[PDB]
């Protein structure tokens, strides 16, 4: 909410509201992802993925990422205060933050015990993504999910933290920064209140530095530009138009 | 080939050419589809698919169909004679036939032993597609694949038959009907020569009627018009642009 001088009752109501908006748009149920942990791609299945063409593997990942971004757009539309920001600021926040929210949410699909991620129905390691031709970026994404894994977030913590990854008053191009500052502050009060009640404020100093999420997003944009030079018709023919608008 | 009065040597070379163009663009190797027959969706995975929103399930199927059509476009580009037709006729043939070729190729991914189709890495029955909201069309596609499964085609027969599904001189809108007629005739000589050498001409009277494939395509176009009314922004935001161009 954008309400100034939010009382303790309003802060408690905002914690409940943010957790409910996230639950309604979390995409996959946590219990399904966890119970599928022992189902891992066989060596022949991994070889099959590695033998796919670069264009087919890029198109598949662009589709899965677009579906995940669609849920983050619905999260933003239901997030208290977001729809009271001006249209320009809503677009500035989603264009810079949709991909960052997806990268944070993906720690739920990551198993630190064997360094695998849930992808297309089973768990597989970074070797599954070899045909993309961007091994360093994929390794950096797996390392980022590994750093979040170490904090063992609850679903309520993911909801409150992803609201703050999206509502960032430092995004360049905001036209009403004062309203974004106010909404960011209220969400910070809600996140801190929840952490204090559950004895988890020690995680604040352990959250990844903002530059890390910025670097992953910038590298994705750069690898897509390299891909588009090698396969210039694939993007306009088959990639989701929302994906081309956010990252091209 | 567009050669008039094609000799027996030219027809035998055309059988080899068509089979090679198909092998290079078959999308999945037949041995890989067969190796995955024991990978079937669990009951919880089926429930998960049935719980998906209609928009999410339509978007996934539109992506998978578009990827299959991209292989059929490459099949056409490598098919003897196709690139010698005029630009208009190439587009008229692909716009009417790419979906029909995909439906025929899909019989390789259908297992009659359990009535399941390979989809998103595993085999599932028609119940997997419930969230699309087009049960009659899905059931008709499974029945069509079941009819082709009973003909027990070899890979060479699929290659020669799909070349003929694409090179159809009766498509409305062709500008050089006579040139397509010559290519269609040479491909028919190649298909009939292969069938005669292998004692399989008895399948000609068992091929699906002139109307079965057009009905499936017309039903897809009708269900997409119903979907686009219920979710008018999802198509323009996330569906592949090639899909929207071919079927909207």
């Amino acid at each position: 909410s954008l309400a100034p001088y939010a009382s303790l009752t309003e802060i408690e109501h905002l914690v409940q509201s943010v957790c409910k908006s996230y639950r309604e748009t979390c995409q996959l149920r946590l219990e399904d992802l966890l119970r599928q942990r022992s189902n891992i791609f066989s060596r022949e299945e991994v070889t099959g993925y590695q033998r796919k063409s670069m264009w087919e593997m890029w198109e598949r990942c662009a589709h899965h990422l677009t579906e995940a971004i669609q849920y983050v757009v619905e999260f933003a539309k239901r997030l208290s205060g977001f729809m009271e920001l001006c249209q320009n600021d809503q677009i500035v926040l989603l264009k810079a933050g949709a991909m960052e929210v997806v990268l944070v949410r993906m720690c739920r699909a990551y198993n630190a015990d064997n360094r695998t991620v849930f992808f297309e129905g089973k768990y597989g390691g970074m070797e599954l993504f070899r045909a993309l031709g961007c091994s360093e970026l994929i390794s950096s994404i797996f390392d980022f999910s590994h750093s979040l894994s170490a904090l063992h977030f609850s679903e309520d913590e993911i909801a409150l933290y992803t609201a703050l990854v999206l509502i960032n008053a430092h995004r360049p191009g905001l036209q009403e920064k004062r309203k974004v500052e106010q909404l960011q502050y209220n969400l910070e009060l809600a996140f801190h209140h929840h952490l204090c009640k559950t004895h988890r404020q020690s995680i604040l100093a352990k959250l990844p530095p903002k530059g890390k999420l910025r670097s992953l997003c910038s590298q994705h944009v750069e690898r897509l530009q390299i891909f588009q030079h090698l396969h210039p018709i694939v993007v306009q023919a088959a990639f989701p138009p929302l994906y081309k608008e956010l990252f091209s | 080939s567009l050669a008039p009065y094609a000799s027996l040597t030219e027809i035998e070379h055309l059988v080899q050419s068509v089979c090679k163009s198909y092998r290079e663009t078959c999308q999945l190797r037949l041995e890989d589809l067969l190796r995955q027959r024991s990978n079937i969706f669990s009951r919880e995975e089926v429930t998960g698919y049935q719980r998906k929103s209609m928009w999410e399930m339509w978007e996934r199927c539109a992506h998978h169909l578009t990827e299959a059509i991209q292989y059929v476009v490459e099949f056409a580009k490598r098919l003897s004679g196709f690139m010698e037709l005029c630009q208009n006729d190439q587009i008229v043939l692909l716009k009417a036939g790419a979906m029909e070729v995909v439906l025929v190729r899909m019989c390789r991914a259908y297992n009659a032993d359990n009535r399941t189709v390979f989809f998103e890495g595993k085999y599932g029955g028609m119940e997997l597609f419930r969230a699309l909201g087009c049960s009659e069309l899905i059931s008709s596609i499974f029945d069509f694949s079941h009819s082709l499964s009973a003909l027990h085609f070899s890979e060479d027969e699929i290659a020669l038959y799909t070349a003929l599904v694409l090179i159809n001189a009766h498509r409305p809108g062709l500008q050089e009907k006579r040139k397509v007629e010559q290519l269609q005739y040479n491909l028919e000589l190649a298909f009939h020569h292969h069938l005669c050498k292998t004692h399989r001409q008895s399948i000609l009277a068992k091929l699906p009627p002139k109307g079965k494939l057009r009905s499936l395509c017309s039903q897809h176009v009708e269900r997409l018009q119903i979907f686009q009314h219920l979710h008018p922004i999802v198509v323009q935001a996330a569906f592949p642009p090639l899909y929207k161009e071919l079927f909207s």
């Binding site: 757009v73 539309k77 809503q90 677009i91 264009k95 929302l242 608008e245 091209s248 | 323009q236």
Partner: peptide
């Protein structure tokens, strides 16, 4: 460069 799609998704309701 363009934001026509994001704009339409945001105004869907």
């Amino acid at each position: 460069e363009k934001h026509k799609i994001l704009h339409r998704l945001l105004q869907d309701s």
